[PDB]
Ligand binder design. Structure first.
Ligand SMILES: N[C@@]1(C(=O)O)CN(C[C@@H]2CCCCN2)C[C@@H]1CCC[B-](O)(O)O
Ligand SMILES: N[C@@]1(C(=O)O)CN(C[C@@H]2CCCCN2)C[C@@H]1CCC[B-](O)(O)O
Ligand SMILES: N[C@@]1(C(=O)O)CN(C[C@@H]2CCCCN2)C[C@@H]1CCC[B-](O)(O)O
Ligand SMILES: [Mn+2]
Ligand SMILES: [Mn+2]
Ligand SMILES: [Mn+2]
Ligand SMILES: [Mn+2]
Ligand SMILES: [Mn+2]
Ligand SMILES: [Mn+2]
Lengths: 306, 306, 306
């Protein structure tokens, strides 16, 4: 099996410095050797250098770096599309979660029936009209869902984007910090999610069983796993931009990834929002990067029983 | 929906200095803004000043500060009774857990059919004849339960207390540090409880289901939630006087509070035993205070999915 | 009603210094008083001094200290056999896990129909032909299981060992760091195990139920509990030689011990691999030793509900 690794050192989906160093931190934590050890044939695309945009002024005096985020995601989408074309499962290292616009667009280009597992403390589904931060890393899903497009105005640099996913084709796992307009969107478009509360009730084994019944119970589909490291409790993943108490345990995160691998359908994976600069110690930065590597490795077959 | 907040800075139910600063620490952690944000209309009664009793000698050369605990609880009960009659759900901030004598007596004064959910590492059900510490914060339930009163002698300053509640009307959640005479009492009077072991077996969802079926399965009753911060594992709630390893997780504490809110019946809440002076660091004190606010907020409707 | 305590301060099953101070550390954390309070009549054999072997060269240029480990276990087996013969449940404090060769051989010498519950992050079932470390604490099970013996060469100092326990008579709980040859052995011999993943799926209550169904579902048998402290998550048991992320919680460990007690069949217990020199602080050392005392005390009747 063949896996392409793409560093996407992007930070302009939000305002905190340092998430552009996530890809190097994850690499420094041993990613490539771990993937090789599993039998993965590897193509390293390196870290992309995204084309800047001069005078990328706020959109509507709120939305930050719109043209830079639109253009970086267009370029990323091109690399993901071509790698998925050439037979690779695509691992994209971030970088902030606005990059999911690019990886899911590029993925869907060649696999239009793909489904999405979004593992995250946050829903990332604000629109340009509901965001209260202006940060695109909290809006990427709104640009991707067919059913929402009449409520998403067109941003400078975003005209290449055509939503390719139905709201029935994404499931969230781990929600615990949702804005009211996001909650409204989830309920109003009947988007399925398992919050931390649902995990407390069902247990992660049932959560995964129901996730796959919703997504692939009728038919096999390529799976896009978009994993925000802040889905994990901050005690485990402290080096990240928007930590929220009461997250996944280590064991729960491994279990999610093991179940992803067990479908045999994993086609692309994002590992986003590792920001080593927000660690208060080198150890905090390395434990976060090591946890990122554990997620990716388990998603491609690393087991706890050997 | 109206919420009264009462500071009860009492420490004479036990011997460790500093729990009288519990109410200020909780207020400082942002309680009042959190309750407003949920839509609660608030009346802050401030921090009560309890009348001292001169020459409050030990009772039976063992029980410490009996008259002061008795009189402070008499005064607290009056405030609680008044706030309930004016339509407020009553939040009392402690302070050591002997204040539940006052809040439950005042609550039961005009709601004699109330039920009690007692969240705690301890049963607090020693009598003056079984306590080996002499600390009234470890005896409050013995004064409240009608079936026990033939076995509870009359302490100086306690004559105003009339046990209003049946032993079928209290459920414990989180027990893990129980004296042999307390275990006898729980068994002998058939008092229902879910120890940490029961949570390990059943899961917190079923624990709450069985709690409400036992208490409100046949009729709606105002709920008194007496929440001792030491129900949480000491890694989460270190700033407290009697910590015991193996406690509730954060998620379990939130889930309890969420289910309390979901009944619609919460009528009074005690948040006791936060002692900021027992934290070894400012960060330990503040995480303990912040956890207290999360419990209260979740008990009045804060959710994890927005 | 009677418990023997044997200190086995052995370190030559592995290469890290200090695990020979496990027994003293566990005793200093209050083991004997805790056992007495449960009503255990106690015989303390102290710490054994094992006979050295001159010129104990590597076996096959790989296996370290073979004769010293063999002889020390022969001597330990003799002490365990006598204690079990005289009516004592035998508690052996390690020391590295190669001592289970001695404690299980000595136990079986008096109770041949014993069964084994092996709580560990590791399977410890490498043979001299599969070990990649050469450390005998990672091989003890291979010397004990009847079905494996054609694949186990005879080591100098090991000829006294009579391996008559069946592979159907051991169950593992907690596995998460298993070598590929150990995985092959476990599958090829149909040895039953509950990995951390199984615990994630089933919950520790069902794990224990199924463990006892496999071992004592048809008849009562004396139970040998061999408990490697590194089964627990490293955050709870840091002072140990091979820590592995994602282990048992405190509550899961207590629950295992409680169910061991509840069978009424506990006949011997090993508490191994506490190495206080690997703690980065005195706090980490004492937390690990206190956890070891909790495991042993719970295995002999300490409950969380009193
Ligand atoms: N919804 C947000 C947005 O900016 O839209 C607001 N903020 C959450 C929090 C909610 C209430 C307290 C103040 N802020 C983060 C989130 C983006 C997460 C992006 B990611 O990729 O890490 O998930
Ligand atoms: N049972 C106690 C009492 O004093 O009666 C004794 N002590 C428990 C513990 C038992 C093991 C040996 C050391 N002591 C705490 C408890 C009071 C807790 C009051 B609270 O409001 O925090 O719950
Ligand atoms: N299988 C081992 C052996 O030495 O045989 C290899 N080693 C850990 C090794 C490190 C990284 C690669 C995979 N695992 C520990 C185990 C022995 C544990 C003995 B015990 O009593 O602590 O359980
Ligand atoms: Mn995200
Ligand atoms: Mn997030
Ligand atoms: Mn209490
Ligand atoms: Mn308590
Ligand atoms: Mn081990
Ligand atoms: Mn071991």
């Amino acid at each position: 099996h063949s896996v392409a690794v793409i560093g996407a050192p992007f930070s302009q989906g939000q305002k905190r410095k340092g998430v552009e160093h996530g890809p190097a931190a994850i690499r420094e934590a041993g990613l490539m050797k771990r993937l090789s050890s599993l039998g993965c044939h590897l193509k390293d695309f390196g870290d992309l250098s995204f084309t800047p945009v001069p005078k990328d002024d706020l959109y509507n005096n709120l939305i930050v770096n719109p043209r830079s985020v639109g253009l970086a995601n267009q370029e990323l989408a091109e690399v993901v599309s071509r790698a998925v074309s050439d037979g690779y499962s695509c691992v994209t290292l971030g970088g902030d979660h606005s990059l999911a616009i690019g990886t899911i667009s590029g993925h869907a280009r060649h696999c239009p029936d793909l489904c999405v597992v979004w593992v995250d403390a946050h829903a990332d589904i604000n629109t340009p009209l509901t965001t209260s931060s202006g940060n695109l890393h909290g809006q990427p899903v709104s640009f991707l869902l067919r059913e929402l497009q009449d409520k998403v105005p067109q941003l400078p640099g975003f005209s290449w984007i055509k939503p390719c996913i139905s709201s029935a084709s994404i499931v969230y796992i781990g929600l615990r910090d949702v804005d009211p307009p996001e909650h409204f969107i989830l309920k109003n478009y009947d988007i399925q999610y398992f919050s931390m509360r649902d995990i407390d009730r069902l247990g992660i084994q049932k959560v995964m069983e129901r996730t796959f019944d919703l997504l692939i119970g009728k038919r096999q589909r390529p799976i896009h796993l978009s994993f925000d490291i802040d889905a994990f409790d901050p005690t485990l993943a402290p080096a990240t931009g928007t930590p929220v108490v009461g997250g996944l345990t280590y064991r729960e995160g491994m279990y999610i990834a093991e179940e992803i691998h067990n479908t045999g359908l994993l086609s692309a994976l994002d590992l986003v929002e590792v920001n080593p600069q927000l660690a208060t110690s080198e150890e905090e930065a390395k434990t976060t990067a090591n946890l990122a590597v554990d997620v990716i490795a388990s998603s491609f077959g690393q087991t706890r029983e050997g």
